[PDB]
Write a protein that binds this DNA or RNA. Structure first.
Ligand SMILES: [Mg+2]
Ligand SMILES: [Mg+2]
Ligand SMILES: [Mg+2]
Ligand SMILES: [Mg+2]
Ligand SMILES: [Mg+2]
Ligand SMILES: [Mg+2]
Ligand SMILES: [Mg+2]
Ligand SMILES: [Mg+2]
Ligand SMILES: [Mg+2]
Ligand SMILES: [Mg+2]
Ligand SMILES: [Mg+2]
Ligand SMILES: [Mg+2]
Ligand SMILES: [Mg+2]
Ligand SMILES: [Mg+2]
Ligand SMILES: [Mg+2]
Ligand SMILES: [Mg+2]
Lengths: 104, 67, 70, 88, 117
RNA sequence: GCUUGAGUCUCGUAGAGGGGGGUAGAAUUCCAGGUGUAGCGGUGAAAUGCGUAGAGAUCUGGAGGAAUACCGGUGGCGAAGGCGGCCCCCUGGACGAAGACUGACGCUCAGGUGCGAAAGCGUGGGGAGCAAACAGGAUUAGAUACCCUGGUAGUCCACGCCGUAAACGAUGUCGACUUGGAGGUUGUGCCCUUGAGGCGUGGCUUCCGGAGCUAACGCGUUAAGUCGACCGCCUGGGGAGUAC
RNA sequence: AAGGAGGUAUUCAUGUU
């Protein structure tokens, strides 16, 4: 299993749905027996520049150990979901189960 | 001189650490050269990747004439 | 290079500060280099020649700093 | 390249002694598995000339090892090509 | 006519010519002036003095609106690039911001070929 | 038979190495609209050209193509050509540490096969910017040019063909030996890391220089030094890399 | 554009700014 690290920024209007989306993605990964090493909802953060004329996205970070097929499926879900403004998934060698600097 | 990263034995830049990236960018938003900063070459490349990833995630501005 | 006039700041000082900020940014140099298309061969040749010139004079100074001028 | 567990399985299968990795049979088996694996990749990416060069090196190395084994021990050569299904 | 007491001065300073345009904060243009209108032609219109007189002409043009505050946005590699700012200060506006807005590409379109002169 | 050459395995390291697919922002162009008015554009100086049907400028929205500022470095990677935003998938090579393993399995290579910048060709798309040809305006005694305003192939994509470059380090590949210094980059061992340090030990890489070599220029442990193995090539200049 | 200084260039507390 490959360690991934996902950050997906959500439209602030849809901030009330973020725990639901978090639960759905967690359930998918857990159903695929993927580990979840970190999950940190950063909240609204006042983006440096207006993405699609919108500010203050809901960042939400999540470090995961899961297979690549489920990651690809999750990426497709991100692309098709209008709620999430942006997302990025990056491979990592080791699961960094430590506190994030901004949360710290 | 005085490469800051090798002083603490940092393994990776961890782009989420904005404050360090703020030190290593200029007011206009571009990356300060390693010749000026004093960073080692390997950490400089890691720092450049981290800043670019942060710019994509909109934690840092590409330029000051953006928003 | 955004500049905002500080409280109790003279205009001439502000203008000189703005010129300093533009110099540090290197705007004029960038646009001037981008005025015309430089071929990749020309760019590589120019960079290499400049490095050679810099290195040569460094060696020249560091060596000729041990001689009797008079 | 090739995963660790797959390499361990091949070494166990073809090794005269389980820890004898340097065996010519083991090397040929490892090369054959890697060559067979890359067939799908190069079918997908016909323009990957840089990787195909490494593939050619593997093929040439395998035939050199096979020639050496044929010189040294004919029976081992026949058995190995039977195991791996290699034309001559 | 609609007094606003704060304007934006866009100074487009090319090598050949300098165009100064006073506008509202939102973007609607109020008045403009250029060295060509100032009468200088060619080698004389590509000089800082022409930019200064064009800035003065523009300030007179937008004098009707009674603008007091003025933020400056200077753009382009122009010969003067500064004489316009000095002229506006002399004309008697409070300069609030001095901002450079030169459009620098991030390795975009190919520039024209080098001149062989 | 042996283990020193060669190769395999264990753990890590750095890299614009390659292929495929997404995505980001700046910028150019065009379109629609608002504000606003007589110039804009260009040159050594002008004109062609564009603008009262409202240009240029300024603001908002949209479409599209191409390329990735800063970082960036006589830095890195690749056999060479060459490779530069970020992310994911597939994939090649190199190097270091400690060992274990096979046991000469090696080096070179005519024919042969493959890769091979740019321009060019075929079929089908795409087309923002740039720009051979071409058109116009200038310059000049002339200007089939340099300069200016436009501008088609092409530059981009997919699949084929072409197979040439000052494809250059003008230096074939492999191996061994021979004084040094200053750096860069990437590993790694030890010494109290007395905190950014001190002493080693590899790989790749830039400069200076000794013997030696060279016609000289210069090369100089990455040799053009002292040698060994294999291959390619030269025999005065033109005619000619031309004719058949 | 012209003149002066330092270096191969920076360490030179952050803060302030
Ligand atoms: Mg291998
Ligand atoms: Mg031009
Ligand atoms: Mg190399
Ligand atoms: Mg041949
Ligand atoms: Mg071509
Ligand atoms: Mg074609
Ligand atoms: Mg066509
Ligand atoms: Mg032309
Ligand atoms: Mg043109
Ligand atoms: Mg040839
Ligand atoms: Mg070349
Ligand atoms: Mg040759
Ligand atoms: Mg060979
Ligand atoms: Mg030398
Ligand atoms: Mg011929
Ligand atoms: Mg020829």
């Amino acid at each position: 299993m490959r360690h991934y690290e996902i950050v997906f920024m959500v439209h602030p209007d849809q901030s009330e749905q973020v725990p639901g989306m978090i639960e759905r993605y967690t359930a998918a990964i857990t159903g695929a027996e993927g580990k979840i090493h970190r999950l940190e909802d950063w909240g609204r953060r006042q983006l440096a520049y207006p993405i699609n004329k919108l500010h203050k996205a809901h960042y939400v970070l999540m470090n995961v150990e899961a297979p690549q097929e489920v990651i690809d499926e999750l990426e497709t879900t991100f692309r098709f979901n209008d709620a999430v403004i942006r997302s990025m998934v990056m491979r990592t060698k080791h699961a960094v189960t430590e506190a994030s600097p901004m949360v710290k | 001189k005085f490469c800051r990263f090798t002083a603490e034995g940092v393994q990776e830049i961890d782009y989420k650490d904005i404050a360090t990236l703020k030190n290593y960018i200029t007011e206009s938003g571009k990356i300060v050269p390693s010749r000026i900063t004093g960073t080692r070459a390997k950490y400089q490349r890691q720092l450049a990747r981290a800043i670019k990833r942060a710019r994509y995630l909109s934690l840092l501005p590409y330029t000051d004439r953006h928003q | 290079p955004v500049i905002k006039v500080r409280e109790n700041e003279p205009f001439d000082v502000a203008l000189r500060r703005f010129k300093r900020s533009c110099e540090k940014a290197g705007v004029l140099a960038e646009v001037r280099r981008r005025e015309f298309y430089e071929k990749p061969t020309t760019e590589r040749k120019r960079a290499k020649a400049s490095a050679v010139k810099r290195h040569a004079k460094k060696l020249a100074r560091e060596n000729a700093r041990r001689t009797r001028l008079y | 390249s090739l995963s660790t567990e797959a390499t361990a399985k091949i070494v166990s299968e073809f090794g005269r002694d389980a820890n004898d990795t340097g065996s010519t049979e083991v090397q040929v088996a490892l090369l054959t598995a890697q060559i067979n694996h890359l067939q799908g990749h190069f079918a997908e990416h016909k323009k990957d000339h840089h990787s195909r060069r490494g593939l050619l090196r593997m093929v040439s190395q395998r035939r050199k090892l096979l020639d050496y084994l044929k010189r040294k021990d004919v029976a081992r050569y026949t058995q190995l090509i039977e195991r791996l299904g290699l034309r001559r | 006519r609609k007094q606003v007491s704060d304007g934006v001065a866009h100074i487009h300073a090319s090598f050949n010519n300098t165009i100064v345009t006073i506008t509202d904060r939102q973007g609607n243009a109020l008045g403009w002036a250029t060295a060509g209108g100032s009468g200088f032609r060619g080698s004389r219109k590509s000089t800082p003095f022409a930019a200064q007189v064009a800035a003065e002409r523009c300030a007179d043009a937008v004098k009707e609106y009674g603008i007091k505050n003025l933020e400056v946005m200077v753009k382009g590699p122009g010969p003067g690039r500064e004489s316009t700012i000095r002229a506006l200060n002399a004309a008697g506006f409070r300069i609030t911001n001095i901002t450079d807005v030169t459009p620098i590409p991030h390795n975009g379109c190919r520039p024209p070929k080098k001149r062989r002169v």
